[PDB]
Structures are given as structure tokens and as C-alpha cells.
Design a protein around this motif. Structure first.
Motif, PDB file in Angstrom:
ATOM      1  N   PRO A  28     -15.956  -9.047  30.630  1.00 10.96           N
ATOM      2  CA  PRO A  28     -15.354 -10.149  29.870  1.00 10.96           C
ATOM      3  C   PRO A  28     -13.841 -10.033  29.842  1.00 10.96           C
ATOM      4  N   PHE A  33      -7.112  -7.861  21.430  1.00 12.14           N
ATOM      5  CA  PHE A  33      -7.256  -6.862  20.383  1.00 12.14           C
ATOM      6  C   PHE A  33      -7.328  -5.463  20.985  1.00 12.14           C
ATOM      7  N   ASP A  38      -9.570   1.620  25.279  1.00  9.86           N
ATOM      8  CA  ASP A  38     -10.355   1.746  24.059  1.00  9.86           C
ATOM      9  C   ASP A  38     -11.371   0.624  23.902  1.00  9.86           C
ATOM     10  N   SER A  39     -10.999  -0.603  24.266  1.00 16.93           N
ATOM     11  CA  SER A  39     -11.862  -1.752  24.023  1.00 16.93           C
ATOM     12  C   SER A  39     -13.001  -1.820  25.035  1.00 16.93           C
ATOM     13  N   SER A  42     -16.826  -0.483  24.277  1.00 14.78           N
ATOM     14  CA  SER A  42     -17.883  -1.282  23.665  1.00 14.78           C
ATOM     15  C   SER A  42     -18.786  -1.909  24.719  1.00 14.78           C
ATOM     16  N   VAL A  43     -18.201  -2.436  25.797  1.00 11.79           N
ATOM     17  CA  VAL A  43     -19.013  -3.047  26.844  1.00 11.79           C
ATOM     18  C   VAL A  43     -19.611  -1.978  27.751  1.00 11.79           C
ATOM     19  N   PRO A  48     -19.392   3.747  21.119  1.00 11.94           N
ATOM     20  CA  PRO A  48     -18.085   3.930  21.758  1.00 11.94           C
ATOM     21  C   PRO A  48     -17.503   5.312  21.510  1.00 11.94           C
TER      22      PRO A  48
ATOM     23  N   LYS B 216     -15.123  -2.134  16.731  1.00  6.39           N
ATOM     24  CA  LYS B 216     -15.801  -0.966  17.298  1.00  6.39           C
ATOM     25  C   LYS B 216     -14.938  -0.260  18.342  1.00  6.39           C
ATOM     26  N   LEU B 217     -13.629  -0.242  18.113  1.00  9.31           N
ATOM     27  CA  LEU B 217     -12.714   0.483  18.980  1.00  9.31           C
ATOM     28  C   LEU B 217     -12.414   1.857  18.389  1.00  9.31           C
ATOM     29  N   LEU B 273     -13.602 -12.196  15.118  1.00 13.77           N
ATOM     30  CA  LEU B 273     -13.152 -10.952  15.733  1.00 13.77           C
ATOM     31  C   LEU B 273     -14.380 -10.153  16.134  1.00 13.77           C
ATOM     32  N   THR B 274     -14.417  -9.725  17.394  1.00 21.87           N
ATOM     33  CA  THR B 274     -15.561  -9.013  17.936  1.00 21.87           C
ATOM     34  C   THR B 274     -15.090  -8.054  19.016  1.00 21.87           C
ATOM     35  N   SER B 275     -15.948  -7.091  19.340  1.00 16.98           N
ATOM     36  CA  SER B 275     -15.649  -6.154  20.407  1.00 16.98           C
ATOM     37  C   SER B 275     -15.667  -6.862  21.758  1.00 16.98           C
ATOM     38  N   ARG B 276     -15.039  -6.222  22.748  1.00 17.32           N
ATOM     39  CA  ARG B 276     -15.096  -6.742  24.110  1.00 17.32           C
ATOM     40  C   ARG B 276     -16.534  -6.827  24.599  1.00 17.32           C
ATOM     41  N   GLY B 277     -17.379  -5.892  24.161  1.00 16.44           N
ATOM     42  CA  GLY B 277     -18.774  -5.898  24.555  1.00 16.44           C
ATOM     43  C   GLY B 277     -19.539  -7.121  24.102  1.00 16.44           C
ATOM     44  N   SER B 278     -19.215  -7.661  22.928  1.00 16.08           N
ATOM     45  CA  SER B 278     -19.929  -8.805  22.374  1.00 16.08           C
ATOM     46  C   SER B 278     -19.167 -10.115  22.529  1.00 16.08           C
ATOM     47  N   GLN B 279     -18.048 -10.119  23.259  1.00 18.47           N
ATOM     48  CA  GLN B 279     -17.287 -11.353  23.433  1.00 18.47           C
ATOM     49  C   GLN B 279     -18.050 -12.399  24.234  1.00 18.47           C
ATOM     50  N   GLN B 280     -18.619 -12.025  25.380  1.00 18.88           N
ATOM     51  CA  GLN B 280     -19.508 -12.914  26.116  1.00 18.88           C
ATOM     52  C   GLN B 280     -20.877 -13.026  25.461  1.00 18.88           C
TER      53      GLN B 280
END
Ligand SMILES: Nc1nc2c(ncn2[C@@H]2O[C@H](COP(=O)(O)OP(=O)(O)O)[C@@H](O)[C@H]2O)c(=O)[nH]1
Lengths: 51, 430
Positions: A28, A33, A38-39, A42-43, A48, B216-217, B273-280
Motif C-alpha cells: 500500500p 504517518f 517502522d510502518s 504492520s503489513v 510489529p 501499531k508502529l 488513522l490506521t497502520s500501513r497494513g490495514s490501509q488497503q
């Protein structure tokens, strides 16, 4: 045996094998942010860890 | 028209403004050399709100930077977009207050404030139509807590009809980086409650908690906290700079959010506001926006909003959306949480919609909520104050520079009375 007796070399024949389909999931885009390293945790995984 | 100027003091104020101006610059598409390179025509129609025009086609913020030490300003000169500030606005001392309210408010601050008051008066006279002032500080530092509040008092004495906003970082005991936090916090609140038209508190504990659980960073930083604060800051004033279905200026917010003149302390929230993992993975909808909006955990403060009843609420949506859905969602939430809303004033939720979303996001939400749950922070601050004051701890510095313990007693009495009268309306029934 075919080489000497029949004077005919037998050339083996290959075969088409099974090819599996695989799906691709794109990273994504950066929302704005935190930081990239670091970000991306999560993905990368549910839990993390520090880059 | 109806423009405002930015005034920042102390390390915290300077660093908050440092990325507030960066976010505004990114939103308006201005280059770091002052050359406009935007794409939309709407980016220039209301640029006069925060930018003054200069020869050569460049723009300069109406920002005034003050401190009793020059290091923080010499450092913010290094940050990105730090070359937009007009050099004359930088006013710095040569000694420093040493986290002392007396030093920052009586001897050195009173002498130093003359030049910054002159330049602030010049800026206020220069503008076409003045709307108000916004001032950003933290209560954990002496120079800030003294000089900022004294300038609030001086500006209020000269402009009684204008509006005043204060962006207050109060020291909570969990993130305790100073032992003299509550002396300065109580002394600053005592003066602030009298003069500030609006105040909104921000807690670093809440910022870090948001960073760990919402985004969640793993490594939250001062930059992330400042970015969140700056986004929340711009969410309030977006509607004044961009068109929308129902415009609502800061004066309208002041009218609709403050029932009694002494109850002007707020806590805010920003969505989504959300993590990169949950953005999509996530989907951007009005129900999701409002459920993340009204979540107790989403608040920008460590105070629990389900421990009290909301006196009033204000919402600022960004993006193109139907108003009927917004109204029905707010009605549904107000019906489903009637126990947490005061009953003698019906329809205590205000709605505002702007058609310009933030860059990179399709929908956005800013919440400002005046509730009785903010009493806990004041109660714990007063408890720490009376604990440290019962044995006259660290009062020799304060008593050796002109101010006495009678002022401390008056400040404690005023703060306790404020807490009591703020919780009085919680138990009031019709
Ligand atoms: N958001 C944010 N807050 C900060 C930062 N650095 C310090 N603070 C907060 O500012 C408060 C201390 O302010 P202080 O530096 O003593 O103010 P000063 O005396 O005017 O320079 C503490 O409560 C910190 O949590 C930062 O980089 N970002």
C-alpha cells in the motif's frame, strides 16, 4: 539394444508439466504517518517489531 | 479576509509550529523557497489566511517565534520549510529561564516581551481584517508557562473583542520529564483560565499510546507526535480556508461549544488513522469514520471520556459526502449513547462539512469535545501540587524572585474551585 540390433537410436520425448498460478499483492502507498521502515512492519507481519 | 497570525514560544511551541507550517505548506503546495507550484485554483484564493505576499511572488507566514534561549530557533532554522520564516520575528533571550515560572514571567520575560509585543502589534495592525490569535505552548516548561501566558494576558488587555485559542500541552505524571511540572502547570492554568477564550489540552502519554496501538508502529518519535498534532490543528481551520456546504468559523465554534464563559477547556480527536497494513484492508465510509471518531480510546488525551458526560461536541468533516448520512449517523450515535450525554440541553452536537479533503486522503474527521471527564487531569495535577506544596518543597527559588506563597494559595484555591464548578454541572438534572 536398439542402437546395435536395430541400428536405431531412440530419442526420448519430454512432457508438459503442471504450472501453478500465483497471485501478487502490492504494498500500500505511504499514508503520511511514521516512517517507511517502522510502518512497513504492520503489513509485513501481524506483530510489529522494531526495524 | 478573517485571517489569523501564528505566535509560538518556547521549545515546544516552536517545534509544534515547525511542522504545523510544514503541513500547511504541503496542503497549499508552496515550495521551500516560497514559489507556488500547486495544481488546483482553490489553493490560492484563500492563501492570505496564513501567507503574506512579497515582491517576487513569494509568500511568508505571519509567524512570530519567541524564546529566552536561541538554540531552539537556530535548530528550527535547520528543519525543512524553515527558510520561510521572516528573520525579524525571531526574538531570543541570552540567559534562559531554567524551567522557572518566576524567571519566565516576572524579571526576564517582562523585560523581553517589549519587542515581541511591538512586532505582534505591527502584525495585527497590518492585516486587513483580524479574526483572532492562536498560541501554542506546553505547561511543562518555565519560560513557556510564564511568558506565553503573560503575552496572552497582554494581548487580551489590548484586543478584548478578538478570539484566542491556546494549544496547551499539560504535563501528565506518566510522562513526567520534570519534577517541577505541577507548580508551573497550576500557575499557568490559574492565569490561562481567566484570559484564554479557548484552550485544548494535549497529552504526550495519549500521543504515544495512539502511536503504539492505533498506528501499531514500533518506534514513535517526536516527529510523529508533532505530525499528529499538526494534522489536528489544520483540521480545525481547514473549513475557514476552503469552501464547504456549511461553513463554521472559530467564532461560531466558540458560540456553539462554550455554554459558560469559564468552561472553555477541550479535548480533540482526528480520523481516520490506521497502520500501513490495514490501509488497503480498511474501507473509508461515514460509519467507520464516526465509530473511530467517537471511540473513547481515539481521544487525544489520557482522560477516559466514558467516566463523564459530554457537555457538547463539534465535528468537522473533510471530503465530498452527503449531509443526510452524516446527520443520521450523529442522531444514531446520540440515541445509542444517551447515558453519556447531558440531558438538560438537547442536540449538543454541531456538524460542519468542507468539500476539500486533505492531500492523500479522501475523507477526514476532526472532533472537539467539551465533556466533564477532563476533571481527572486537573484533580491529579492539584494532588501533586498540594503534595509538593505541603512541605514547601523547591519554593526557595520562587520566593527569592519577588513572588510569594500567597499567590500559590490563591492559585490552588482557584483551581480547586474551577474543578468543583466544572463537576457541579455533571450532577445537575432538569
Ligand atoms: N510533541 C512534542 N512534545 C514535546 C517534544 N519535546 C518535548 N515535548 C513536551 O514538552 C514538555 C516540556 O517542555 P519544555 O521543553 O520544558 O518547554 P520550554 O521550557 O519552554 O522549552 C514535556 O511535557 C514534553 O512532553 C517534542 O519534540 N514533541
Amino acid at each position: 539394444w536398439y542402437l546395435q540390433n536395430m541400428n536405431l537410436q531412440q530419442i526420448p520425448i519430454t512432457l508438459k508439466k503442471e504450472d501453478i498460478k500465483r497471485f501478487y499483492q502490492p504494498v500500500p502507498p505511504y499514508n503520511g504517518f511514521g516512517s517507511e521502515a517502522d510502518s512497513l512492519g504492520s503489513v509485513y507481519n501481524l506483530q510489529p517489531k522494531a526495524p | 479576509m478573517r485571517e489569523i497570525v501564528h505566535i509560538q514560544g518556547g521549545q515546544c511551541g516552536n517545534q509544534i509550529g515547525a511542522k504545523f507550517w510544514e503541513v500547511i505548506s504541503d496542503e497549499h503546495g508552496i515550495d521551500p523557497t516560497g514559489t507556488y507550484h500547486g495544481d488546483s485554483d482553490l489553493q490560492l484564493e484563500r492563501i492570505n489566511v496564513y501567507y503574506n505576499e512579497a515582491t517576487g511572488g513569494r509568500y511568508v507566514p505571519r509567524a512570530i517565534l519567541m524564546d529566552l534561549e536561541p538554540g531552539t530557533m537556530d535548530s528550527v532554522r535547520a528543519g525543512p520549510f524553515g527558510q520561510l520564516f521572516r528573520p525579524d520575528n525571531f526574538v531570543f533571550g541570552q540567559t534562559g529561564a531554567g524551567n522557572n515560572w518566576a524567571k519566565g514571567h516576572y524579571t526576564e520575560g517582562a523585560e523581553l516581551i517589549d519587542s515581541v509585543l511591538d512586532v505582534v502589534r505591527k502584525e495585527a495592525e497590518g492585516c486587513d481584517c483580524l479574526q483572532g490569535f492562536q498560541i501554542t505552548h506546553s505547561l511543562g516548561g518555565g519560560t513557556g508557562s510564564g511568558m506565553g501566558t503573560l503575552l496572552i494576558s497582554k494581548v487580551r488587555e489590548e484586543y478584548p473583542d478578538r478570539i484566542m485559542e491556546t494549544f496547551s500541552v499539560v504535563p501528565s505524571p506518566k510522562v513526567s520529564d520534570t519534577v517541577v511540572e505541577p507548580y508551573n502547570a497550576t500557575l499557568s492554568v490559574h492565569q490561562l483560565v481567566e484570559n484564554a477564550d479557548e484552550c485544548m489540552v494535549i497529552d504526550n502519554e495519549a500521543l504515544y499510546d495512539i502511536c503504539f496501538r492505533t498506528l501499531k508502529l514500533t518506534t514513535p518519535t517526536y516527529g510523529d507526535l508533532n505530525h499528529l498534532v499538526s494534522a489536528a490543528m489544520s483540521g480545525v481551520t481547514c473549513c475557514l480556508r476552503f469552501p464547504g456546504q456549511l461553513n463554521s468559523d472559530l467564532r461560531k465554534l466558540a458560540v456553539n461549544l462554550i455554554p459558560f464563559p469559564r468552561l472553555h477547556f477541550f479535548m480533540i480527536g482526528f480520523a481516520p488513522l490506521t497502520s500501513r497494513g490495514s490501509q488497503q484492508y480498511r474501507a473509508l465510509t461515514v460509519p467507520e469514520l464516526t465509530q473511530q471518531m467517537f471511540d473513547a480510546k481515539n481521544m487525544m488525551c489520557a482522560a477516559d471520556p466514558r467516566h463523564g458526560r459530554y457537555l457538547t461536541a463539534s465535528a468537522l468533516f473533510r471530503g465530498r459526502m452527503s449531509t443526510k448520512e452524516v446527520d443520521e449517523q450523529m442522531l444514531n450515535v446520540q440515541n445509542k449513547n444517551s447515558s453519556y450525554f447531558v440531558e438538560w440541553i438537547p442536540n449538543n452536537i454541531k456538524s460542519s462539512i468542507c468539500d476539500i479533503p486533505p492531500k492523500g486522503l479522501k475523507m477526514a474527521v476532526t472532533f472537539v469535545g467539551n465533556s466533564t471527564a477532563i476533571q481527572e487531569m486537573f484533580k491529579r495535577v492539584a494532588e501533586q501540587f498540594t503534595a509538593m506544596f505541603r512541605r514547601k518543597a523547591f519554593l526557595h527559588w520562587y520566593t527569592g524572585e519577588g513572588m510569594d506563597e500567597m499567590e500559590f494559595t490563591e492559585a490552588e484555591s482557584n483551581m480547586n474551585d474551577l474543578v468543583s464548578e466544572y463537576q457541579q454541572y455533571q450532577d445537575a438534572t432538569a
